């Protein structure tokens, strides 16, 4: 019945073969079968005659997609957690000069990854930057926030402005005195 | 460990903080295990060299 596949490369295939008990364990726990074809270089996820969760089989499709895009197994079980979400953001369709593109995604990732990790803390998601793709997984509020932020980041506002926006926003919503105010009296 | 991390990133292409030629990387490994204090930034002898 319901079945999906995804290709991978070989340097991840080593990791796949070394961890492959864990994915089939979690997935037959959710009554999802998974198999692995080496000459095909692909993974396969299918359902059986007992599976009762369409949400979880779409989730398993997301699982092999993320594992093909080379995120480790802690993040894999964090997406197979229910109220989480993967999300892919492309940046390659913004700017003209290649060198400016390089320096701008370096401005994103920041010295010692610090801007990226502060963003990950303040949104409770995980980010990973691959050239023209940026993968992110976590809750939907953090995902919407990081989508706005990275699009303005490959535009030309700075992530430091965004990080100050995030911490001020989270505090101002934490103090349970304001829910009517548009908060632009506080944000610069 | 740092070299295997660098190889996995550059094989499955990630970006990473660019550091000078002396020091090592700075990972969650070294931050949690707290190895900077008992190994250091770099080989100081080769640094002066």
């Amino acid at each position: 019945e319901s079945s999906f596949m995804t290709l991978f490369p070989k340097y991840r295939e080593s990791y796949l073969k070394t961890i492959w008990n864990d994915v089939t364990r979690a997935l037959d726990k959710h009554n999802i079968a998974c198999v692995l074809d080496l000459v095909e270089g692909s993974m396969t996820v299918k359902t059986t005659r007992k599976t009762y969760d369409p949400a979880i089989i779409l989730k398993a499709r997301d699982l092999i997609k993320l594992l093909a895009r080379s995120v480790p197994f802690p993040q894999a079980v964090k997406i197979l957690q229910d109220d989480m979400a993967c999300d892919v953001i492309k940046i390659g369709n913004f700017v003209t000069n290649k060198e400016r593109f390089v320096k701008r995604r370096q401005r994103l990732v920041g010295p010692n990854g610090n801007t990226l990790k502060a963003l990950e803390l303040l949104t409770k998601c995980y980010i990973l930057v691959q050239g023209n793709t940026v993968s992110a997984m976590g809750p939907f509020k953090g995902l919407k926030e990081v989508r706005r932020v990275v699009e303005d980041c490959m535009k030309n506002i700075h992530p430091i402005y965004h990080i100050k926006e995030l911490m001020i926003k989270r505090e101002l919503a934490k103090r349970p005195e304001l829910a009517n105010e548009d908060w632009s009296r506080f944000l610069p | 460990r740092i070299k295997k991390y660098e190889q996995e990133a550059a094989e499955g292409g990630i970006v990473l903080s660019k550091v000078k030629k002396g020091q090592f990387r700075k990972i969650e490994s070294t931050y949690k295990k707290d190895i900077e204090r008992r190994i250091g930034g770099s080989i100081k002898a080769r640094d002066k060299e």
Binding site: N112, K117, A118, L121, K124 | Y31, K32
Partner: peptide, 25 residues
Amino acid sequence: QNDLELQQFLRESHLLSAFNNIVYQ
């Protein structure tokens, strides 16, 4: 980058992650 709280949070951004796995104040 002249701010005081900002950059301290920025360089502690990996330490709080490592000892956490947010109480950042």
